[PDB]
Design a binder for these strands. Structure first.
Lengths: 90, 103, 95, 77, 74, 69, 96, 79, 97, 79, 102, 92, 102, 92
DNA sequence: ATCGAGAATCCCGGTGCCGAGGCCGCTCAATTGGTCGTAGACAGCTCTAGCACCGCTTAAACGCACGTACGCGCTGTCCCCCGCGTTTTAACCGCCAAGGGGATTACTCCCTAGTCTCCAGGCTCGAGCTCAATTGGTCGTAGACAGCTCTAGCACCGCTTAAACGCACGTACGCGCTGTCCCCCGCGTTTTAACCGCCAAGGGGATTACTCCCTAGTCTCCAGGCACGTGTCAGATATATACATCCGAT
DNA sequence: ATCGGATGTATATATCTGACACGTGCCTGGAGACTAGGGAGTAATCCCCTTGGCGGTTAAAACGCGGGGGACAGCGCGTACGTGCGTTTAAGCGGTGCTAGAGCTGTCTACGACCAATTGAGCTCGAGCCTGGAGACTAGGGAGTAATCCCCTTGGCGGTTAAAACGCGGGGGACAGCGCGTACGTGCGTTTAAGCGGTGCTAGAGCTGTCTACGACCAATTGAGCGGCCTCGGCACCGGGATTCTCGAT
């Protein structure tokens, strides 16, 4: 049975080193992450299908993020995605 | 050396990629797609945890509980928009009394 | 001593908007859930967390509907919610 | 069993919704509304159980029903 | 309008010149000034007529205008 | 230039005001009154123009001048 | 002894233009003010200085109106002010 | 009631005297009363509106000063 | 001269336009609006005719439904005239605000 | 420029008539325009996004239909 | 054809191909496209039935979008199924709240 | 330029239910949009059903359950009846 | 103090606060309350000068409302500025029309 | 219960202009009314001026122009002179 | 019109006291000293609208007698009505109380947060495991370019339906009153949910064989889409038809 | 509420015309047999484990009854705003024509994701601690509800300066009438604003790009208003001087 618990906790330690999290809150964070995952992956899938493409690329992910996230969240998410892909490629 | 480490992320790039391959989204998945996706999920997790931590600190609690998640989500216009049709279990509601009801 | 009508009402509003505990009694809600389920499929059993999920969903739904009902009451320059308010809120929601 | 959703419980739910004054006729109306909601959700939930050839309604069945009814619930994954 | 456009414009420009040099005027500014002037004068002549009739006359005279303007607070 | 406000024009204005008979001395008085009015209105209009750092008096400046009077 | 018509009138003009005391009786005016206010809202109270303000305003208004009335009377080569003079003054002031 | 009759004939005479008036037609006094009443109404109406806006039950000097200002009869000294 | 009482012609117009289906916004001004809004997102865009017609169908269907809900809110408040607070209540309950 | 004013007063009245509205406050029209503008923005943004993703310069009917579908306003007839 | 074997008018083969290429699952059973085609056919038949009824009520021989809107919105279950759907060129149902009438 | 659609099947059904009635191009386009919409809804829910139950095959069972979730009441019962009859006729 | 920096007696700070809290504009320049205080001070000084003059003409050492009314009405520009202003307890200027004299 | 007024500043000005002259309470009330009245007039006109020119800040220029609108002739010239000297001294 | 002679009256000389005014404590709070970004603001550049500056022209407004009747003005009086003394009646007022509720403060109560104490809940170190990182070959998906004809965009214009603006105005919305149900608060009695413990077994989850159902590759010939021509139903047009509404009267 | 006339909508209708959906023909691609391979859905089967069950206790909440104040729903009235219409503009629109950018379709080809092992590696569960946290209790506080007490009303008992009225006579208001100065409608001469046009052009408004002035946020401070305490030109006042007016006068 997989979950995001350890990754959510690592992020929490990054943003609040001396702060913890309850079991219910961790379950809610896992539900949240799964929800946003499903939304973005589904929109990317439709983008690829709509354009008769068989590959979901970072561009489909980015466009899906632009469609799903409002305003400032969208701009920072696109920025983080771009930074991450550039760091990964090299 | 893990892909998350090469990408500077905490969320598992490999696992997200596998979930993409097996989630029946497309026949093939590009190498950059799970890195980007993992980065977006990590950003949102960090943002939500930032506000929820703030709310916890206002409440002199060291652990984020569902109440803080509801305060964090509902007090941020764009996060509230993203999660407009979502119920946070044990979250309650925002304190709010209509002015006409006050004495 | 006697508080005026509304003061204790406001106190209760603040009290229950401050907290998160479940507001329907466990056993009657469970009994209702089993009664309703029986009319769809015989011999059903329920996980505890399934009933707790149903209860969280029901109370969240009712609190939101009652929020909208309150806005509808105030819209008519009233402070008391009435059935016609609920029916209008549900009609505009598309229920 | 619908009468088990007592008057003070509905009052408390209304209090959380910010309501200050409550008509006497609200309670029966609320009960009817609740029943409809439950029926719809439960109808989908039990259906999921039946597709899986199970006899026990699980938390995932209810969460899935709520999601497919546009009332996604976080925290019981 | 009852005053000829161009002489009114000439008057307006002369008066403006004694306040600020090198001024130009928009057409609609002069038309606005003319509407205002004609409305003011017609109203003042109405009041003048009331002053004349008050003195059991039918002919307006300078003293009628001066009385009207004094009571207006001009 | 005040003499450009001719005798028949002032007569027409008085006719619109309902005046039936007009002393010959009326015309100069009317011209003076008009001149005074114009000075005041134009003074305000040009004052507004200078505040806006413009060299063209606009219709809106005049309307504002009239409003404040 | 008897003064001719106008001498005592002129003396009265000089007397009251020299001085500043209020010329309407305080209490009868007060009843008037309370009556008028009561015909707008019942059971109203008044600050003392509020009634004095209304009274000062009323007398200043009336003195000015009588000045204008006098100018209209003199315009008509009369020395007695009459209702048509008041009506002309108020028409030109823009009150009617 | 009928307190408008409290603006007496000698009071109107005294006000006319300050305005420089030497002779007074018998019909002036009633006419003056009507005019005064109208004036008062206009002022007091506005004053009460301000009082009502402030949710107060006592008309204050400032209410009257504001009424006079907005009617173009600004009064100095009671601020 | 003849004069219909207030409301008779309103009702007649309601019946007329609920009976029929033609678009109620002028074609060209709506098209210009759409092109302006799109241009403030990306310059030099073109539009297929049917794309603008689709946007117009969507806008009018949305507005008619919103006005239905607004009317229900007005009737609820024992009024017959819809007002801005009615629009805001309808959209608040719809979940748009 | 100022193209929102092309949504005229009689057009908004007609839309309200189809919605069963008998009387319309004067402030409704401007209010409606704002609401309409917001709606269009939300749709058009998504539509243009699809256009940009496809590396096209012409917004097609399908872009709009997709935007509407993903905004929960599925529109039939332009597929 | 499989449609003929199943007694249907809608194309079972085509639905099967769209299922294979819509990336819904790795495998698709042989009975699934028959059932799906049958359901789609039934719903099409129900809407066309109601729309035809409405068309005849209006003395028209050709179905236009207005009849589709009338058929769908005047039937509670189709209206529920299509609660968030706009029928282009459909208009609305005639309906005036009783309190506004004289 | 080959574009497939459901036009001929909608028309055949129309002739079954109303033999002397036709249909405009706009209405046929709306019917095609409808059929595609319902196709997407049922197929997507069936895919989700199979995933939910750790099954890799969408069978008539997933289609039937998706129909029961998506269609209201009597519409659902009739659709299920049509589907079951069709599958049983096909198997024989 | 800013009044001292500007060489003034009227309170620049107070005028600034009243401008900030009178909801006249979103922003207020640093020179505006200084300028305003200077203008208010000048006009106050001119009226008090004239009223003092009138007071001394009446062999009075204290300015009373009568002196303020006399000062204002006998000066053309102040009378113009305060044309629609009532000076409480001011009275009026003595003036009898020549035709009224014997 | 603290009520602010201009009394002490008016009195300082009085001592500048008439060293051995006083002022009554009623007269002091009239002076305070005067200062408040002119304050409102000038500030309001300056606000309108700024609005007319799509400016959100009242600076010495709007105040000065308002003063020129409000004060007659030599009174306006003298007030502007006093204000300019005061602002230039303040800036230094 | 102005000379005087007598008189009620307003102003000057000098005074009691006197209450409003000038002067001092204080605290405290509006006033001010630094500081930071931040957007509002200043400054430059365009360029073309529209402002300006003038060359005919011409036709209607402007100007010079003109004489001529109308209204301004100027007295002449009659009668009215209004100033002025005088008195008497009385409501304004001096000054004091009185209740007259109304009033911002003080007594009283539970509420919300403070402080402190022993625990349910997760933190931390130690091993099995499905899953994650490598890289080669590969087979195909997508990136990129050439060309086109498809279609979206730009411009002129008749005319006309629609849009914009003004006049009543009466049906409407909004606000004050009030009779009255009806729901909030409080408290006493009764269930009935919470809690805790113990058990049962029926159903969910892991294990292993297998076989039937799904997929892979591929040819075809037939259903389905692209045109295509067309004849019937929809759009239109003036008839004329009966259905709705407005304005008197039972 | 009913009943007629008078206009004023839509609805039914015969006639005409034209656009487009349907039967037809043609093309091509894909659905269906067809066989074999393999892979996951069935079927036990076995275990265990999770919520029905019961039982007992307990103690906290739901009911019910009552009290009583407070919102609801007419009811009526004020005023004022959208409507209906009329009249006058304004741009839509359908046409028609040009005209060039991009969707599309096809070709070519380096890029890259999929399996296939292959290692090993991070997650994940178990056992063993533990240390912030829930809450248990409690103490100051924020609140109303009265509640004794000052701020604006209302007698009252006269005291008393002033209004009402007489009346009395004398000074204007207005009507008559007349005399004459003067605007004004006519007529004819004139002369210049409107209009058009043609050309030259300074700056209004807009776009852009930086630049600095202040709204706050702390954080420390002295000027002044409340309050109270000496103090003096002024208000009332008496005595007296000098006046403004009214006869008396031609």
């Amino acid at each position: 049975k997989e979950s995001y618990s350890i990754y959510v906790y690592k992020v929490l330690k990054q943003v609040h080193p001396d702060t913890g999290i309850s079991s219910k809150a961790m379950g809610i964070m896992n539900s949240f992450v799964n929800d946003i995952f499903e939304r973005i992956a589904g929109e990317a899938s439709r983008l690829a299908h709509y354009n008769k493409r068989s590959t979901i690329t970072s561009r489909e992910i980015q466009t899906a993020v632009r469609l799903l996230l409002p305003g400032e969240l969208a701009k920072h998410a696109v920025s983080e995605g771009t930074k991450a892909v550039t760091k990964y490629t090299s | 050396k893990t892909r998350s480490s090469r990408a500077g992320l905490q969320f598992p790039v490999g696992r997200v990629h596998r979930l993409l391959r097996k989630g029946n989204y497309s026949e093939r998945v590009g190498a950059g797609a799970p890195v980007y996706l993992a980065a977006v999920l990590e950003y949102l997790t960090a943002e939500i945890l930032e506000l929820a931590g703030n709310a916890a600190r206002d409440n002199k609690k060291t652990r984020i509980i569902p109440r803080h998640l509801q305060l964090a989500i509902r007090n941020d216009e764009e996060l509230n928009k993203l999660l407009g049709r979502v119920t946070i279990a044990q979250g309650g509601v925002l304190p709010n009394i209509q002015a006409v009801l006050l004495p | 001593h006697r508080y005026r009508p509304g003061t204790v009402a406001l106190r209760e509003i603040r009290r229950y908007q401050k907290s998160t505990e479940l507001l329907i009694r466990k056993l009657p809600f469970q009994r209702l859930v089993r009664e309703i389920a029986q009319d769809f499929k015989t011999d059903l059993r329920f996980q505890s967390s399934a009933v707790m999920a149903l209860q969280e969903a029901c109370e969240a739904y009712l609190v939101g509907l009652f929020e909208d009902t309150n806005l509808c009451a105030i819209h008519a320059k009233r402070v008391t919610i009435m059935p016609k308010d609920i029916q209008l809120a549900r009609r505009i929601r598309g229920e | 069993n619908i009468q088990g959703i007592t008057k003070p419980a509905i009052r408390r739910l209304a209090r959380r919704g910010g309501v200050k004054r409550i008509s006497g006729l609200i309670y029966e109306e609320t009960r009817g509304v609740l029943k409809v909601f439950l029926e719809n959700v439960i109808r989908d939930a039990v259906t999921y159980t039946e597709h899986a050839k199970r006899k026990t309604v699980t938390a995932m069945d209810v969460v899935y029903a709520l999601k497919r009814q546009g009332r996604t619930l976080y925290g019981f994954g | 309008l009852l005053i000829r456009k161009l002489p009114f414009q000439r008057l307006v420009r002369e008066i403006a010149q004694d306040f600020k040099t090198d001024l130009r005027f928009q057409s609609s500014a002069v038309m606005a000034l003319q509407e205002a002037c004609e409305a003011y004068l017609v109203g003042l002549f109405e009041d003048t007529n009331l002053c004349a009739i008050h003195a059991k006359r039918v002919t307006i005279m300078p003293k009628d205008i001066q009385l009207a303007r004094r009571i207006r607070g001009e």
